[PDB]
Amino acid sequence: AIIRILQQLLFIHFRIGCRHSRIGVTRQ
Fold first, then answer.
1. Residue 27: Cβ within 10 Å count
2. What is the CA radius of gyration of the chain?
3. Where are the domains of the chain?
4. Taking a C-beta distance cutoff of 8 angstroms, is the pair 8, 2 a contact?
5. What residues contact 17, with CB distance under 8 A and at least 6 apart?
6. Please, are residues 24 and 18 in contact by the beta-carbon 8 Å criterion?
7. What is the DSSP letter of 20?
8. From the centroid of its chain, how far is CA 19?
C-alpha cells in the first residue's frame, strides 16, 4: 500500500497546503 503509506506523510503537506485558502471546497 505504498500509495497510502507515503500518503500518510503527503497527507500532511497536502493538508497544510490546502489550508492557505481552504481549497477544500473543490476549487483546485
1. 7
2. 10
3. 1-28
4. no
5. 23
6. yes
7. T
8. 9
Q: Any idea which residue has 506523510 for its cell? A: 9
Residues in the chain: 28
Cα separation, 9 vs 26, whole angstroms: 21
Write out the three cell numbers for 27.
476549487
Q: Which residues contact 9 (CB under 8 A, 6 or more apart)?
A: none
Method by which the coordinates were obtained: NMR
Element at 18 (helix H, strand E): helix 2-18
Which 8-state DSSP code applies to residue 9?
Answer: H
The C-alpha cell 493538508 sits at 15
